[PDB]
From a paper:
Soluble transport of molecules into and out of the nucleus occurs solely through nuclear pore complexes (NPCs), 40–120 MDa ring-like channels that perforate the inner and outer membranes of the nuclear envelope (NE). Here we describe a nanobody library comprising 12 unique nanobodies to the Y complex and Nic96 from S. cerevisiae.
We also solved the complex of Nup1201–757-VHH-SAN10/11 by MR using the published scNup1201–757 structure as a model. However, there was no obvious additional density for a second nanobody. Analysis of the crystals by SDS-PAGE showed that both nanobodies were present in the crystal. Only one large loop, residues 187–203, faces a solvent channel in the crystal that appeared sufficiently large to accommodate a nanobody. We hypothesized that the missing nanobody bound this loop and tested whether replacement of residues 187–203 with a flexible linker (GGSx5) would ablate binding by BLI. Indeed, we found that VHH-SAN10 no longer bound this Nup120 mutant, but as expected, VHH-SAN11 still recognized Nup120. In a reciprocal experiment, we replaced residues 431–439 with a flexible linker (GSSx3) and tested VHH-SAN10 versus VHH-SAN11 binding. This experiment confirmed that VHH-SAN11, and not VHH-SAN10, binds to the 431–439 region.
Residue numbers in the entry:
A (entry chain A): 1 to 29, 53 to 188, 204 to 207, 225 to 263, 276 to 292, 296 to 302, 314 to 400, 403 to 500, ...
B (entry chain K): 1 to 47, 51 to 124
Write the structure that this text describes.
Amino acid sequence: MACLSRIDANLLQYYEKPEPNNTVDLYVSGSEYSNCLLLSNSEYICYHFSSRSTLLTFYPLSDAYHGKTINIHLPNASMNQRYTLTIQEVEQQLLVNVILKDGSFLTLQLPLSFLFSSANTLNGEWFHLQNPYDFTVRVPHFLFYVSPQFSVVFLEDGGLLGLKKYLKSSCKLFHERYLIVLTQNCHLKIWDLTSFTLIQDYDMVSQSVGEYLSLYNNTLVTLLPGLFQMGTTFQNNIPTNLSASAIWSIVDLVLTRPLELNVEASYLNLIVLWKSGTASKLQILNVNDESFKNYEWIESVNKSLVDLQSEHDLDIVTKDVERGFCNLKSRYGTQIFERAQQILSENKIIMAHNEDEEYLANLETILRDVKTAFNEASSITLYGDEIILVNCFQPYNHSLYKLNTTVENWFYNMHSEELFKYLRTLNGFASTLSNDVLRSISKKFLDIITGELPDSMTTVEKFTDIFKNCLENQFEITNLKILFDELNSFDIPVVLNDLINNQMKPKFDGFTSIISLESLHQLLSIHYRITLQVLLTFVLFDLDTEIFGQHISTLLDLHYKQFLLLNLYRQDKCLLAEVLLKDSSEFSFGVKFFNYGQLIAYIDSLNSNVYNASI
Amino acid sequence: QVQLVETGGGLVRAGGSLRLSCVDSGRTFRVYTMGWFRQAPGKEREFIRWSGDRTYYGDPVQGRFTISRDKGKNTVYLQMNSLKPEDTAVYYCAAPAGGGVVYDDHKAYAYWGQGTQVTVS
């Protein structure tokens, strides 16, 4: 069962002018990797290593448009992308260690206040490379930053060196001096200080460069080319299996404490990312105490709600080729749209403007491909205390996998096995209706609320008219029979109350906006679909205004509000963010997301501010 | 059945000035443009889309010819300053259908309106 939703975050979406206005290019004489680093102050800075070598960008995640970016070029290419580089913050300063192709070792010293100030160019010899103590014959592809101001550097044929500028004797550092290395065969190897020897090495044990190690407290997780080997100065435990159909390659791997899930008592959680070309899959291992009672696999929705609404034509709220052109310009960030426009101009595809369909279809498919390429995964970062974040390839592109509520779990996992069954039957009938009928029914409900349909009409008369104007057309009568017979099995008022009263109705940001807007959009779109289906049931078979009076009233109310907020999401997401973040925040700038429950609580607070507004 | 007439051509000495015009009778769209292609006698037809959002000129006439459009209309003018014997050809309007391109002979749903012109020295 999928328990996590993908939330695509384009840090430049709300503004109509990418890239950010302030960019700093520092010289020293598509994408490939991206990650995010946490500084001393409450701020996350991102760095990208695109187009192999000679590329070092930096930008703050919080203020990506107004905060400035730092492009650090490189004089000589590197022997390895993303693996030759260690970024660590020491004394309020980012230490950047790179081995170029010339055999030279460059140390970049980026102060914290520089990346956050509005300064254009600052003088100073921050760059200072080292020609000696390296040779052309022996080139190392890796570089690991030891905590006590040290850098270990491994080569191909099982050898290492230590940098003190030169002292000699996957990989991660257990405890303080214990370097747990990994080989190509593979087989792990421990180190210590005791810098000369190894506590224990691993045998092949057959019958029983990337990120394949993840340690947490006294528990290590390794990958066996797949078999998830576990190991708790001891080095021994039992491996677990995977779920694979085609060929997948792991991106990143993080072992963490448990998060809020719908499982029994557990002991550890294991976030693993896999990637097939452009597509990516996130999975979570849930392990009970002492790594023996359970080993559950939790899936996730590998695509956001926007991509699914654009693929399967489930969208209803969105509304000529000029209006559709603006809709496409708003549904994607200006960066994606400009990239698509440039790709089309290179191929010499002149727009046909008005009354054009080939051009709009080509623009749609090119935008889809561009966004799917932008969202290619490269690394994982833990946000807040337990928030999950995935850095995409292209800059200013990230994806948060949010914990799903009961409503969202019911929505994403329809096909898996009391209110859930009622919603399942409602959707089983509602899927048989074309989007035209659904839109006409929703517009009839809007007419009911606004007063365009007469108020002297009884609600039963209103629904008879809605049927005889929209549902009077041919719908499979056998589907109506199935729906009625299945609805006869439920206690309808009880589940209706459960849906309405409990389930539905209850430092610049910036980044809180980019996530909060999308999560609220997802929640309210699910609410809108469910409300449309319930009111469709009301229209199909007329019901007494007495039984579901307050029910139908609140239903029309919430449907009106959902439609209004979805249409306000269709255009000008920036001002929607500004209003929603000024209404609910003490500083009108939002809330800092520290845990899953806190994020869901803020989303529910926005939902409450929506459902209780003045009509 | 929209038409696409054009006038303004003729015979002039080298270095003179002419003014080609071309309008549409039918409604169609406010979208399709009118490529001012040319064809020399024996040669192939050679080289203001979407309300002047972008313009493209050929290399043999850049800086010498000037195209212009009226706002929200299907009218295309071509001020041809500094004419030379190399400009001696037959010029055509144009009108696309679906996705188009400014550098091909696939561009038009309807051109027509052929007109012969010459240049002496």
